[PDB]
């Protein structure tokens, strides 16, 4: 019975293990993304108030 | 052996869910300041088209 127990207890194991490691993989994929998209919101911002102070000129 | 695989199991399993909950809530918030962050671009990017035209003209 303990056996059995243990057994089924390991595949449990192993499978709950592996999908949380496959979305941890994916969650770093997007916070990558995320970072990326902060770049580019600062470089459009930059863009913007430049090109603005020009005009005003 | 048996009673020492049970309990070895049973703390990989609490240690497995409890970062697979912490990688979920990650994957949440990520997904959120993005689509945010996007947003912001596109509106950035309309802004410096509009003022970049006004400019020239």
């Known amino acids: ?3 059995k ?17 496959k979305d941890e993989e994916k969650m ?13 919101a600062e470089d459009a911002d930059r863009k913007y108030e430049e090109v603005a102070r020009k005009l005003v000129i």
Chains 1, 2 share one sequence.
């Open 1 to 3: 019975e303990a056996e």
């Open 28 to 40: 770093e994929i997007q916070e990558i993304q995320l970072k990326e998209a902060k770049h580019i």
């Open 5 to 21: 127990a243990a057994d089924e207890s390991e595949r449990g194991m192993k499978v709950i293990e592996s999908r949380a490691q």
